[PDB]
Amino acid sequence: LIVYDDLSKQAVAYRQISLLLRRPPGREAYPGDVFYLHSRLLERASRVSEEYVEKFTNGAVTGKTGSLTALPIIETQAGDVSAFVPTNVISITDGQIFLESAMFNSGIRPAVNAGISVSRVGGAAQTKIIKKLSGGIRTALAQYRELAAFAQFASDLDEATRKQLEHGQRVT
């Protein structure tokens, strides 16, 4: 497992070298190969087959698959995900965990926005127990998202809509 605490600072260091070498600038003054910088790095994080390990180790290791999982970190400016470096890395990765300032200030400490966060691998990367219990959790959090306003006026709600809301507030 590898953590790159700031890929945005690596991009800033590569931009500095490129401008000092007098290479032609593009959007936000980054060089024409800033996408290739992060893509060449992030495509190494992978899972390799048993045949690859058997070929690499000259038969010393057999029947086992190796892997490298990556958790790159990027810092946005005022929630702007459309900036050049954030846009490149969002398109290279398998999924995104979005943290929000409004949720973090509302006491929701691990500030994960479940509505936009995605994992394209999905249940293939989950144990049987978690996969089975996770489906109900997602429905509740979606319901609460569609019924949050009715929390300051719960008195006037159907029992069933009132019910969905109370399960949502507890799961959250």
Next chain:
Amino acid sequence: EKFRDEGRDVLLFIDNIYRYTLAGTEVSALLGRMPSAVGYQPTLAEEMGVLQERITSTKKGSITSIQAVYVPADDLTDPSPATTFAHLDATVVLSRDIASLGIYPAVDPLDSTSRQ
């Protein structure tokens, strides 16, 4: 184009037409050319036209293309989506809501459109 010349009707699938535009922007910046509006390459419309004009129906056969489209910042007026929409003949929209009802394929009969 070789299969078309055998007298066939062919399907050309392009994984993402936005990445073709971005690769052109990257190459244009590496060659030092002066950038255009919103930072795209000055050759944006010509590079799209050179690719899209080969996909046609001819006297021998035809090439039909299905291209996945990405919209930057959800802005349909951005130069990349705007240059691409001038070549498209149909728009197929896939809906997460329709897939939730158990219907497959998840096409949205109201948002999807065709010039035909």
Next chain:
Amino acid sequence: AGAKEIRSKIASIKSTQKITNAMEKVAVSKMRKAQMRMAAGRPYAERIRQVIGHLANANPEYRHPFMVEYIVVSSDRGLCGGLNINLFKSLVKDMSGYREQGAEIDLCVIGSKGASFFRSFGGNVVAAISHLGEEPSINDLIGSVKVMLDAYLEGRIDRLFVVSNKFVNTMTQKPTVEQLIPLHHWDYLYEPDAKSLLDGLLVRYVESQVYQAVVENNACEQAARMIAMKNATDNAGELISDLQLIYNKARQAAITQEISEIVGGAAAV
């Protein structure tokens, strides 16, 4: 003029749109509470009408002054989709008609927006009440109703009516005027004298009709509030859509200007 100021306006209008969408369902919920209260009060009024019919028919020896030849209902709060305006528009037609006849008019007012209307045109209000809950109690109406009944007994009023909205359907509130004061083989064992019973029952009947008019107007108010908050939610959506188009223009222009300054500075160095 500035992408960030536009982004702040969009978030502000979006926050407002979320509550007007919730307030529509709250108005529908309160509309159903008012509709059940309208039905619960009908048995009492129809039965009082059935008794007065015999105790007068069967007893032609005595005629109450109310059996031989305006109270205005309005809301106390905002978000009414033309409810009060359509009622005042309909009332002015009849008040104007009484002046073509040359007659004097006495007025009674229920609710704060009705008091504000007559106060802005100098209307000669004789009795008033305001700040009633969304679920009113008949004991509060006794006062305003008695002043109007006394003016009839004193010969100051020839006819009395209740001005209020009627619930045609969940999408249609009708402004109306209803006359209040001027309305088979066996007889009852009257314990008290028949005059005392008829005099008391006619008063209970008129108060019950005013209470039913007030409760039906509250059902019409929640239905009007539903439409007003639905319209507010839709109007905010058009403003958000226009601001998003202006925002995208500012987003594209900022990128084009920054690139022009970077290319211009690197051509000089």
Next chain:
Amino acid sequence: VQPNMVKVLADTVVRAGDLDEAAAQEALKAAEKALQGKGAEFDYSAAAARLAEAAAQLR
């Protein structure tokens, strides 16, 4: 009362000459405080037309 039906038409509050008269005096008192003097009455029609036009644009 009827041989096949018994109806009790109850009252929510205890009516009485003092309570019955007090509510009338409070309703009269409210109307005295509310109205100060007469005003223009011909303006009703113009004000109603102004609000009838303005109320249409909103929907």
Next chain:
Amino acid sequence: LDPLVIGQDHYDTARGVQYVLQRYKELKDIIAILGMDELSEADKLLVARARKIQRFLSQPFFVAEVFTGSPGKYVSLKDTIAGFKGILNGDYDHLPEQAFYMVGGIEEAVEKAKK
């Protein structure tokens, strides 16, 4: 546009028109979402006068006759000040809003309201 150049009567009429139009511009977003009926009794009267002032500023030109057909109008400074001063004072609160559109002098708004 100075009291020492044009006199106090013209200057105050012009300042009065600008104050009414500025206050109407501040209410545009509230009127767009909730409509005119939610405004105060003071704001409702000001918005009605702002709409009349905005329409009375219009004028059919002798070079624009080809575009519409209407004859052109020349309005003196005296007639201009008198019309806007009357609308600000409330002397025309009873006339309909469309009577001020394309009419030259203020007296023609009174004749247009007869239709």
Next chain:
Amino acid sequence: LDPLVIGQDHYDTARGVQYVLQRYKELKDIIAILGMDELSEADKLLVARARKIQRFLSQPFFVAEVFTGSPGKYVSLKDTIAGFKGILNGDYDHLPEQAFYMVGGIEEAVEKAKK
């Protein structure tokens, strides 16, 4: 700002203040278009505490006497914690909003309400 570095009482008071002010930021735009009366009984009370907390953050400094006119106040960590916990728990709901503006510790706010 970690319970393992300072303590749970300080941390809970800080997060409590932040929670109240964060919720008020979305209600500020609601009150400005639809009015205060349309909020819930819990929201109306919370908004009043948020406006009071927002004022109790203020303090006249000794180096700012030339700008403020009033004298300077030094407040301690325990005094700061106790004052904010009092407003969060409702011990000062009866005091007017203007009593917390520019007053050092919590005692002086109780005294300013009497002037």
